[PDB]
Symmetry: C6
């Protein structure tokens, strides 16, 4: 995918962001967007094609893959990145608006907006982490047993690349936890 | 797909747009174009290939897929984005024309044009929402029963990734509703 | 495909073009090039692979697909865009030549050249429309009956995605008609 | 493929080229590079995969495809473009060298070099045209009869998309003839 | 994958880096990123598809490929590049922070930070080398014998392109050793 | 692959290079990088997929393809380009270092470094030529007879596109010889 527009706006907000905030944005670019592009998308590329079920029943593989993976992991991470970035977009928009007003003519209302955006980032990060956990836990097993119609009885289905997917799941979970910790540091640093 | 040209023109119109309008354009880029590029196109990539029908009849799968999906969802969203953006293109063109005339030498006629473009955006958004609804509702079921010739009788066909497609359908519907609400806010803000 | 070079030259000619001409060029970029890139190429991507014929005869599918689609639609639209743009290239080249001569040192000969280029655009547009019509009409049917050797007798062949292709055929026909109408407006506006 | 570097150098030589030369370069970009990228590469994409031979003999299809198409057409056109452009590269290099020498400090030796480069362009164009003609004529037939080992006897093989390939073959031949005529015009214009 | 953002930041740090450091960064770009993009990704492209196991057992190939290659080599090299680059990112961030503070208003604390970043680079490089060694040694054999359920007994599986993969494994190992040696040179040069 | 970074550095070294050196670099870009991108990569794209062996033995095709092509040709050419370019990178780095030192404050040591880099280029070119020759000669035959386990006895395997690959092998060999001759000219010109 093409993240150029998002990257441009995030670069814009870097100028008006705290040091911790700049660390957060660079982490976002290097350890989330770049990982999905260079590494994860290739891992998940053959998710359905190499999904195999031990049956002669038409449509069983499709329904079972859908049940096993309601939403693909890479897609969920895309959404997580976008929603997490959106508060920064709101903040930079507010700042640019203030600048344009000054042209017509981090304190106070602007500072409060910054803190609010940090809070929203934290909430979205926790929400996506919890959602991933309930969806998949954090370990993808090779065997999925499926009892969804049209499959006759329970059928054994086998996932592609489960170990590598587990590795990247855990990597992204760690990155999200790091980003959350950075946000906590931002709040503490503002407090100081 | 390459949206660079459209992005450039939309960026141009940002300068001469209202704050709500800038919010609308950023929503368009981040939550529509970027979603289609990064996420949705991969979801719908194997729509026909992994479409499977329980038959030994040649051509049944092709005719049934065509009947089930007259137009693909991602294509309809492309068209929706383009038509929705077109009013902004008209408005920016009018503004640039006025500027060039001033060189030769948001009020009045220009303001009325802006409001008209907002109205067109609202109409196109509602039209595409209603069209999608009548075409597909908002839930893609896994089973499609097909009675189209050459299929003998009704045949059971099975869709790929129905749950994920439902998730993205609903996501895009929400984004469109948000954009419509933003347009309403634009009109109210102008009224104030 | 990469249209960057053509886009650059067309952007150059925008500066020295009429308001109607700018509308025409933006229509060309947004509703032809962008449609082919984002939407149509994916539609026509699996034209031959998912073309299926009810036979056990080697080579029948290849010969029948070739007979049914002598030239693919997307390719014909590429050619249409290029030939339609070429008059603008001639006009901008003439203008730049005049500028360089002035450096060494829309009226008259330049205006006549502009009108001639409009006429060529109209002729090429009508020609491509008529050619498409005679080749395919404007509705792609799912069933193609083929009697081309090596096929034994008439064989039934089934086209992929006929409905979506019909939708895009009609969309592009509408866009071409709109562009032609714009050219007529250009001539009338010059007359005024 | 990526032609950015070649495009940059050709754009550089446009400044120091004749009006006819600029027409030639724009023809090269729009009607050769852009055609190969947007249209022809997709046509020839499935040349070997959809090549089918009526046999049960392993390796017959590979050897027969190789014999039928020793070099693919698109590849030959790539080479033609590169060799044809190379004289312009030589000329621009000579001009830039002269400029750098003047910094240290179209007539005469430079003009003769320009004419020589035109001559080389004409020779390379004629050579590639004749080579294509002897290789393939100008019509690709659907049926190729192959007697190459390991094929037992003569086997019937069937080419993919022969009509479309014929259309593009003829289109590129016309473009090459146009470019040659332009070179002739360059020489005559210099003579005047 | 797209490394533009990382490349931009690394280019930024080149200005404030030692001569040995610049050599290290150019080695990183030319002999790691460019190798993975141009060469290695194509080698490893068909890792699972052309993985073949001598069995009629569903799911055996998937489980055996996963066991043989828990993480793909190219993915591990991506991670290695990112982690190795991260210290440079920290250093450049610290330097830019100091610059911004000076605006508000290689020695001392900055120099110590530089040395620390060198140490982290060395540790990460050694860690990835050792991890690769324990995972795969440095020779990929063609035969993998697999006893993982559902495979019945030990099954013989055959890897794709083992020799080429061995060649690139050794090439990247050499590059990593060279980079480590460069870091040692950096420390010695600072000592001098 | 993406050669932008290498291209940028090579463009930088053009400014501080001899006329023959500029000819060499343009040859490198136009006749090596552009050929691999536009033409050769498509030729070698289906090397393993269309490799066919006359056997019913699992894994025989993989082992035989690996034995026949230990390293793919396109990969070897990538490595050749990178190693050949590396001396220019060393030279430009040395020159930029001298410039930065002058800021703090082709003759002599710099000239000797330039000659040394030419020598390294010549050695690497000869080495890669000889290596290719011993690996493959310069003609790819269609038939490869393979006796590698698990294949039972000698099996006949058939290569894809052998003639086209031979053509490009010879083309690249010619380009390398031309570059070597250019280096010889560089040394002679310096001698004069
Ligand atoms: C924009 C955000 C988009 C989020 C999209 C979430 C779509 C989830 C649809 C689930 C559909 C479903 O059929 O799921 C069934 C499941 C109960 O069946 P199970 O027990 O067998 O599932 C065990 C796991 N297995 C099914 C794989 C075996 O129900 C569940 O897990 C429900 C889990 C729901 C997690 C939602 C996370 C939202 C994050 C919000 C962040 C923003 C704030
Ligand atoms: C700053 C750079 C940090 C780099 C850290 C690299 C860590 C590499 C760990 C490799 C572990 C291999 C374990 C294994 O050989 O697998 C066999 C099994 O193992 C099992 O059954 C369960 C194993 C579960 C392991 C979960 C590890 C989580 C690591 C989180 C680290 C967070 C750091 C911020
Ligand atoms: C530029 C815009 C391009 C819009 C292109 C719309 C193409 C629609 C062609 C439909 C062809 C057709 O064969 O459809 C048959 C259908 C009656 O058969 P059914 O009851 O089984 O359909 C139930 C759904 N199923 C068929 C999937 C089972 O008829 C229908 O739904 C008609 C629905 C028509 C919706 C049109 C939305 C236009 C939005 C305009 C926005 C600009 C203002
Ligand atoms: C600002 C950020 C907002 C993020 C919102 C994330 C929402 C995630 C919802 C996840 C629901 C999982 C339900 C499920 O586990 O599936 C099981 C079944 O469920 C069914 O049968 C029918 C379920 C139908 C659910 C439709 C949800 C529409 C949500 C629209 C929200 C609009 C916000 C602007
Ligand atoms: C540069 C422009 C490139 C244009 C390339 C045109 C190639 C057309 C080749 C046709 C080869 C052929 O075998 O076609 C046979 C056809 C008579 O057989 P049919 O009655 O069964 O065709 C019914 C349709 N079906 C065959 C699909 C069933 O003949 C025909 O239709 C002849 C139709 C010819 C239309 C030409 C349009 C030119 C536009 C020029 C614009 C610039 C000014
Ligand atoms: C400014 C924005 C304009 C947007 C216009 C959107 C129009 C959407 C039309 C959807 C029609 C669905 C008809 C249908 O449900 O299909 C069932 C059947 O239908 C048939 O059998 C034959 C149906 C043939 C319909 C041909 C429609 C041509 C429309 C040209 C409009 C030109 C505007 C410039
Ligand atoms: C750099 C330029 C690269 C050019 C590469 C040319 C490679 C040609 C290799 C041909 C190998 C061969 O096996 O070909 C056999 C052929 C005699 O067999 P045939 O009668 O059955 O061929 C009838 C056609 N069929 C075979 C398809 C049925 O011999 C022939 O056609 C020889 C034709 C040779 C044409 C060469 C054109 C060079 C253009 C130079 C431009 C620069 C100045
Ligand atoms: C400035 C723009 C010019 C656009 C020209 C468009 C020309 C379109 C021609 C379409 C012809 C269709 C013939 C056909 O329906 O096919 C049936 C058969 O036909 C046969 O058997 C043999 C047919 C062989 C036709 C060869 C045509 C060569 C045209 C060269 C024009 C050069 C112009 C510079
Ligand atoms: C961020 C860094 C991400 C690193 C990810 C590492 C994932 C490794 C998961 C291994 C899972 C496993 O199941 O592995 C089993 C293996 C014991 O089975 P085996 O004896 O048959 O393995 C022989 C090799 N065969 C299995 C192919 C035949 O255990 C092992 O090799 C454990 C080897 C663990 C190497 C970890 C290297 C970490 C580098 C850290 C750099 C940063 C500081
Ligand atoms: C500055 C540029 C340096 C370029 C160096 C190019 C080296 C090319 C070596 C080619 C060796 C072919 C050996 C062979 O024909 O294979 C047959 C077997 O061979 C075997 O069984 C085991 C063979 C294991 C060979 C391992 C070679 C490691 C080379 C590391 C060099 C590090 C330099 C920094
Ligand atoms: C960085 C540079 C990377 C270079 C990588 C070279 C990898 C070569 C590995 C060869 C592995 C092997 O198994 O090869 C076996 C071969 C003896 O078996 P054969 O007689 O059947 O081979 C006849 C040819 N056939 C096997 C296809 C039928 O041995 C040979 O050819 C050995 C040939 C070795 C050529 C090395 C060229 C190095 C260029 C260095 C340039 C920098 C200075
Ligand atoms: C400046 C531009 C130069 C363009 C040169 C284009 C040359 C095209 C040659 C085409 C030859 C076709 C031969 C053929 O029809 O194949 C049939 C067989 O042929 C055989 O059995 C063995 C044939 C082996 C031919 C090897 C040719 C090497 C040419 C090197 C030229 C180096 C120039 C710098």
């Amino acid at each position: 995918g093409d993240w150029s527009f998002l990257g441009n706006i995030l670069e814009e907000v870097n100028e008006h962001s705290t040091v911790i905030g700049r660390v957060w944005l660079t982490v976002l670019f290097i350890f989330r967007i770049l990982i999905l592009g260079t590494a994860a998308e290739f891992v998940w590329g053959d998710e359905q094609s190499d999904f195999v079920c031990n049956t002669q029943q038409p449509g069983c593989e499709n329904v079972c893959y859908d049940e096993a993976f309601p939403i693909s992991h890479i897609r969920l991470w895309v959404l997580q990145i976008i929603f997490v970035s959106t508060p920064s977009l709101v903040y930079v928009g507010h700042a640019v608006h203030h600048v344009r007003m000054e042209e017509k003519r981090l304190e106070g209302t602007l500072l409060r907006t910054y803190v609010c955006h940090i809070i929203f980032k934290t909430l979205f990060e926790v929400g996506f982490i919890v959602g991933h956990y309930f969806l998949y836990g954090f370990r993808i097993l090779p065997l999925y047993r499926c009892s969804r119609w049209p499959c006759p009885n329970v059928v054994d289905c086998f996932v592609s690349r489960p170990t590598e997917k587990t590795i990247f799941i855990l990597f992204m979970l760690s990155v999200a936890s790091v980003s959350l910790f950075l946000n906590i540091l931002e709040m503490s640093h503002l407090g100081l």
